[PDB]
Amino acid sequence: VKDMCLRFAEMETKLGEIDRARLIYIHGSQYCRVETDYWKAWQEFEIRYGNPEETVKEMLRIKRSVQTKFSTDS
Amino acid sequence: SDPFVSSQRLRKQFRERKKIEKKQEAKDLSLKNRAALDIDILPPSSSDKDKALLLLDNEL
Amino acid sequence: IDPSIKKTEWSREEDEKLLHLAKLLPTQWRTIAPIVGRTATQCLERYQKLLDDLEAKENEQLNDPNSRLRFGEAEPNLETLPALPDA
Amino acid sequence: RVKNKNPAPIQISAEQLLREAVERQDVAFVPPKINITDLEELQ
């Protein structure tokens, strides 16, 4: 799903909208080791279009929650 | 001694703490509706803050 | 003993319900218990624990258990205690 | 020293009580079957 989500978010950024782009990034971070394809583009959009104090804490929180979900069963 | 003065002290202590707690859960549940999230959201803690600037330092 | 009793930790909603009821009906725990959902002894012990906890958190920054202090500790009711582990 | 207050690794459970109580039963009583060797006892 992230395969189309990334292109659609790029198109959304090209149009001039940022909120729904990050919204679909968190939406796609919900479908699902060696899964760097998620985080590489996720953090790339974070660096290119993200504020230091406004947004980083919550989405790094979500990253930690996803990793804990993965680590719960092993 | 006081079934009313002491009651307010328990009510005060509870009441202001639930306000900050309801603040977080209202904030986090609003984000999951606009994202169709299905997982529990844990408190930010100091660990995320320590990692946040560490992540942020390499960004800039 | 009966399975209807909720021995789990106190949720926050039932805790505020207990606070509100204990304000509304002073004493009268046998009628507060059905509305809260726990047993009367559980409600009384939880209320006492909340008052003692508030006093403990009050001491850091600064009710008269002195009246309760002038005598010994409360003798636990035999039927409400957890069963002794078997040897 | 018969003073091993140490809590048991296997605590007694109710279902255990009912199971081991029922265990007192055995198979149905087996009587030696009567042998009809002649006609009159058949009758």
Curated annotation (Swiss-Prot), chain A:
HAT repeats lie at residues 16-48. It is found in: Nucleus. Involved in pre-mRNA splicing and cell cycle progression. Belongs to the 40S cdc5-associated complex (or cwf complex), a spliceosome sub-complex reminiscent of a late-stage spliceosome composed of the U2, U5 and U6 snRNAs and at least brr2, cdc5, cwf2/prp3, cwf3/syf1, cwf4/syf3, cwf5/ecm2, spp42/cwf6, cwf7/spf27, cwf8, cwf9, cwf10, cwf11, cwf12, prp45/cwf13, cwf14, cwf15, cwf16, cwf17, cwf18, cwf19, cwf20, cwf21, cwf22, cwf23, cwf24, cwf25, cwf26, cyp7/cwf27, cwf28, cwf29/ist3, lea1, msl1, prp5/cwf1, prp10, prp12/sap130, prp17, prp22, sap61, sap62, sap114, sap145, slu7, smb1, smd1, smd3, smf1, smg1 and syf2. Belongs to the crooked-neck family. This is Pre-mRNA-splicing factor cwf3. The chain holds residues 660 to 735 of 790 of the full protein.
UniProtKB/Swiss-Prot annotation, chain B:
Signal peptide: none annotated. It comes from the Eukaryota. It is found in: Nucleus. Belongs to the CWC16 family. May be involved in mRNA splicing. This is Protein saf4. It comes from Schizosaccharomyces pombe (strain 972 / ATCC 24843) (Fission yeast). The lineage of its organism: Eukaryota, Fungi, Dikarya, Ascomycota, Taphrinomycotina.
Swiss-Prot record, chain C:
Residues 29-51 bind DNA. Residues 6-55 form the HTH myb-type domain. It comes from the Eukaryota. Coiled coil: none annotated. It is found in: Nucleus. Belongs to the 40S cdc5-associated complex (or cwf complex), a spliceosome sub-complex reminiscent of a late-stage spliceosome composed of the U2, U5 and U6 snRNAs and at least brr2, cdc5, cwf2/prp3, cwf3/syf1, cwf4/syf3, cwf5/ecm2, spp42/cwf6, cwf7/spf27, cwf8, cwf9, cwf10, cwf11, cwf12, prp45/cwf13, cwf14, cwf15, cwf16, cwf17, cwf18, cwf19, cwf20, cwf21, cwf22, cwf23, cwf24, cwf25, cwf26, cyp7/cwf27, cwf28, cwf29/ist3, lea1, msl1, prp5/cwf1, prp10, prp12/sap130, prp17, prp22, sap61, sap62, sap114, sap145, slu7, smb1, smd1, smd3, smf1, smg1 and syf2. Interacts with sde2. Belongs to the CEF1 family. Involved in mRNA splicing and cell cycle control. This is Pre-mRNA-splicing factor cdc5. It comes from Schizosaccharomyces pombe (strain 972 / ATCC 24843) (Fission yeast). The chain holds residues 52 to 152 of 757 of the full protein.
From Swiss-Prot, chain D:
It is found in: Nucleus. Involved in pre-mRNA splicing and cell cycle progression. Required for the spliceosome assembly and initiation of the DNA replication. Belongs to the crooked-neck family. Belongs to the 40S cdc5-associated complex (or cwf complex), a spliceosome sub-complex reminiscent of a late-stage spliceosome composed of the U2, U5 and U6 snRNAs and at least brr2, cdc5, cwf2/prp3, cwf3/syf1, cwf4/syf3, cwf5/ecm2, spp42/cwf6, cwf7/spf27, cwf8, cwf9, cwf10, cwf11, cwf12, prp45/cwf13, cwf14, cwf15, cwf16, cwf17, cwf18, cwf19, cwf20, cwf21, cwf22, cwf23, cwf24, cwf25, cwf26, cyp7/cwf27, cwf28, cwf29/ist3, lea1, msl1, prp5/cwf1, prp10, prp12/sap130, prp17, prp22, sap61, sap62, sap114, sap145, slu7, smb1, smd1, smd3, smf1, smg1 and syf2. This is Pre-mRNA-splicing factor cwf4. The gene is cwf4. The chain holds residues 7 to 49 of 674 of the full protein.
